[PDB]
Motif scaffolding. Sequence first.
Motif, PDB file in Angstrom:
ATOM      1  N   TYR A   1     -36.462  18.561 -59.671  1.00  0.00           N
ATOM      2  CA  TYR A   1     -36.009  17.220 -60.088  1.00  0.00           C
ATOM      3  C   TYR A   1     -34.508  17.066 -60.182  1.00  0.00           C
ATOM      4  CZ  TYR A   1     -40.757  15.410 -61.032  1.00  0.00           C
ATOM      5  OH  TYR A   1     -42.066  15.046 -60.953  1.00  0.00           O
ATOM      6  N   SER A   2     -33.763  18.016 -59.626  1.00  0.00           N
ATOM      7  CA  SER A   2     -32.312  18.038 -59.752  1.00  0.00           C
ATOM      8  C   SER A   2     -31.651  18.840 -58.658  1.00  0.00           C
ATOM      9  CB  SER A   2     -31.976  18.689 -61.084  1.00  0.00           C
ATOM     10  OG  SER A   2     -30.579  18.695 -61.334  1.00  0.00           O
ATOM     11  N   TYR A   3     -30.412  18.535 -58.356  1.00  0.00           N
ATOM     12  CA  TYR A   3     -29.611  19.435 -57.551  1.00  0.00           C
ATOM     13  C   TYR A   3     -28.133  19.262 -57.921  1.00  0.00           C
ATOM     14  CZ  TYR A   3     -28.887  15.314 -54.640  1.00  0.00           C
ATOM     15  OH  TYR A   3     -28.634  14.044 -54.230  1.00  0.00           O
TER      16      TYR A   3
ATOM     17  N   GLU B   1     -24.986  10.025 -53.521  1.00  0.00           N
ATOM     18  CA  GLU B   1     -26.214   9.398 -53.111  1.00  0.00           C
ATOM     19  C   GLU B   1     -27.354  10.061 -53.826  1.00  0.00           C
ATOM     20  OE1 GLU B   1     -25.699   6.851 -50.755  1.00  0.00           O
ATOM     21  OE2 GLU B   1     -25.556   8.014 -48.863  1.00  0.00           O
ATOM     22  N   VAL B   2     -28.311   9.249 -54.255  1.00  0.00           N
ATOM     23  CA  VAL B   2     -29.546   9.837 -54.789  1.00  0.00           C
ATOM     24  C   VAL B   2     -30.702   9.089 -54.176  1.00  0.00           C
ATOM     25  CG1 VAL B   2     -30.821  10.341 -56.871  1.00  0.00           C
ATOM     26  CG2 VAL B   2     -28.342  10.324 -56.984  1.00  0.00           C
ATOM     27  N   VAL B   3     -31.538   9.787 -53.445  1.00  0.00           N
ATOM     28  CA  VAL B   3     -32.645   9.166 -52.653  1.00  0.00           C
ATOM     29  C   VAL B   3     -33.953   9.749 -53.143  1.00  0.00           C
ATOM     30  CG1 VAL B   3     -33.547   8.677 -50.346  1.00  0.00           C
ATOM     31  CG2 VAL B   3     -31.056   8.949 -50.686  1.00  0.00           C
ATOM     32  N   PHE B   4     -34.890   8.884 -53.517  1.00  0.00           N
ATOM     33  CA  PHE B   4     -36.148   9.323 -54.124  1.00  0.00           C
ATOM     34  C   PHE B   4     -37.252   8.322 -53.891  1.00  0.00           C
ATOM     35  CE2 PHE B   4     -36.490   6.445 -57.725  1.00  0.00           C
ATOM     36  CZ  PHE B   4     -35.262   5.907 -57.784  1.00  0.00           C
TER      37      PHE B   4
ATOM     38  N   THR C   1     -26.911  16.024 -60.136  1.00  0.00           N
ATOM     39  CA  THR C   1     -27.766  14.892 -60.477  1.00  0.00           C
ATOM     40  C   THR C   1     -29.139  15.371 -60.880  1.00  0.00           C
ATOM     41  OG1 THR C   1     -28.478  12.695 -59.704  1.00  0.00           O
ATOM     42  CG2 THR C   1     -28.533  14.446 -58.086  1.00  0.00           C
ATOM     43  N   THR C   2     -29.750  14.653 -61.792  1.00  0.00           N
ATOM     44  CA  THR C   2     -31.108  14.917 -62.231  1.00  0.00           C
ATOM     45  C   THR C   2     -31.843  13.609 -62.463  1.00  0.00           C
ATOM     46  OG1 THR C   2     -32.440  16.383 -63.607  1.00  0.00           O
ATOM     47  CG2 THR C   2     -30.723  15.084 -64.770  1.00  0.00           C
ATOM     48  N   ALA C   3     -33.145  13.727 -62.546  1.00  0.00           N
ATOM     49  CA  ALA C   3     -34.040  12.609 -62.859  1.00  0.00           C
ATOM     50  C   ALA C   3     -34.733  12.926 -64.169  1.00  0.00           C
ATOM     51  CB  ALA C   3     -35.040  12.384 -61.727  1.00  0.00           C
TER      52      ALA C   3
ATOM     53  N   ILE D   1     -31.733   8.048 -63.622  1.00  0.00           N
ATOM     54  CA  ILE D   1     -30.993   8.832 -62.634  1.00  0.00           C
ATOM     55  C   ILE D   1     -29.653   9.116 -63.280  1.00  0.00           C
ATOM     56  CG2 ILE D   1     -29.881   8.769 -60.370  1.00  0.00           C
ATOM     57  CD1 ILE D   1     -33.023   8.710 -60.380  1.00  0.00           C
TER      58      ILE D   1
ATOM     59  N   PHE E   1     -38.818  15.551 -56.623  1.00  0.00           N
ATOM     60  CA  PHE E   1     -38.389  14.168 -56.858  1.00  0.00           C
ATOM     61  C   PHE E   1     -37.647  13.547 -55.692  1.00  0.00           C
ATOM     62  CE2 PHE E   1     -35.485  10.963 -58.624  1.00  0.00           C
ATOM     63  CZ  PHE E   1     -36.425  10.146 -59.232  1.00  0.00           C
TER      64      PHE E   1
ATOM     65  N   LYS F   1     -32.589   4.315 -52.746  1.00  0.00           N
ATOM     66  CA  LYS F   1     -31.317   5.033 -52.688  1.00  0.00           C
ATOM     67  C   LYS F   1     -30.372   4.423 -53.715  1.00  0.00           C
ATOM     68  CE  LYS F   1     -28.610   4.280 -49.107  1.00  0.00           C
ATOM     69  NZ  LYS F   1     -27.521   4.226 -48.056  1.00  0.00           N
TER      70      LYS F   1
ATOM     71  N   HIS G   1     -18.964   9.024 -51.579  1.00  0.00           N
ATOM     72  CA  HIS G   1     -19.845   8.476 -52.617  1.00  0.00           C
ATOM     73  C   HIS G   1     -20.839   9.554 -52.924  1.00  0.00           C
ATOM     74  CE1 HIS G   1     -21.631   6.672 -48.793  1.00  0.00           C
ATOM     75  NE2 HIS G   1     -22.583   7.492 -49.200  1.00  0.00           N
TER      76      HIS G   1
END
Lengths: 116, 115, 115, 116
Positions: free
Chosen positions: A105-107, B83-86, B109-111, B98, A78, B61, B81
């Motif tokens: 899909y996660s970290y 960050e989640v980039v996909f 974090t997960t999706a 998200i 992802f 992002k 902060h």
Amino acid sequence: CPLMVKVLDAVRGSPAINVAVHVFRKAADDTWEPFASGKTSESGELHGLTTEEEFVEGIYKVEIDTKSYWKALGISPFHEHAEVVFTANDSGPRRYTIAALLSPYSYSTTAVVTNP
Amino acid sequence: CPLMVKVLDAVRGSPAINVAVHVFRKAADDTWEPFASGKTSESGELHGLTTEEEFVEGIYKVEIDTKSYWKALGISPFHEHAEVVFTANDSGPRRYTIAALLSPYSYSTTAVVTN
Amino acid sequence: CPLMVKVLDAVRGSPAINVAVHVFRKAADDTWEPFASGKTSESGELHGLTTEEEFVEGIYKVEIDTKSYWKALGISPFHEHAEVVFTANDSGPRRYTIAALLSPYSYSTTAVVTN
Amino acid sequence: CPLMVKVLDAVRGSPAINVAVHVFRKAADDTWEPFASGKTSESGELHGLTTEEEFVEGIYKVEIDTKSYWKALGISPFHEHAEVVFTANDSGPRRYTIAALLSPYSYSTTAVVTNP
């Protein structure tokens, strides 16, 4: 070693080997300047990024190239990367370990900060 | 609602309320273009960021202002902060959640991507 | 709904659907008494486990059958199950959400406790 | 060392020191028999729980006494403990690292399994 990165794989139950890592430092003009880079070893660890002299105060970004990792394993993940952004050494020198645990899909990420 | 952001607090065992969230879209010149923003609600959620028409394929992002969150609670945090980039991909499911779980020195974090 | 369980899959980026969940209450003799059970829904949630009247203070264990989940997807997992053990306390908020995020060799869990 | 436990504190950004850990093994009669115990060091690590000879096939439960940890720090946490339950050594001897990352209302755990 004032900055170390350690990466684990939550699918395999193993170190995450051969993970590319790029470190940036925010410049005076607010741009992200390349600071150092490397890749994780067979232990999932990346040592030798920087030195006490060079690792001055600043805002640092540790970019862990998770997509490249998963793609090299033939998996479509992802995220593009995992970014870890923090102020370092603003109360004097510290030693930082940035750890990450990866799934497609996660970290998760954590910091261990120690005072030498 | 093609994009929703959810934020939870691992210290207090609660939603993370009134957290600023900024979404950016990567432009052709590799710069980050502002796209959507808001603050999480009492349930830790941020709905209404975009619409199907606007949320085209590309790299996005999501920046979560964790530092201000912790400071407002009187807690010293590590990160500037989160960050989640996909990449948004039309070949996969159509709704993206998200989710982030915050601690002072860590986050997860997960999706959750569904139809 | 004083107790809800939510389960997410970190491999597929989805709710974890049709996962068996068993809740136990610790008895006076320190044994685990069956209390509630069910399977997660299409949204990864399990609602309706108990009622306010039944959910008294005490120590509870939520056991999530992760091994069967992974095996049904053709994946070899590490854990026998995931366990979440906690005390329900009337002095705190009244609604408990136990959330778990699953990978084959890892899991994350948090509590969201609200009024 | 065929079984090691490592614990980190997500609030402090440090190893989780002095964390009690109890390991159980499921007996023939389906009860949880005490197998070994110890506590984490100043590094957050617990070594020396068992031996290759004693760490036979079985279902093991690693109980990490998170409530006792947080209470000793004067914090009222959510969970009683974190339990990690797994079959070990069923394809021959392996080395297991059980890692945990703790917050007052949350934890994560992962396994690193290696073949010597």
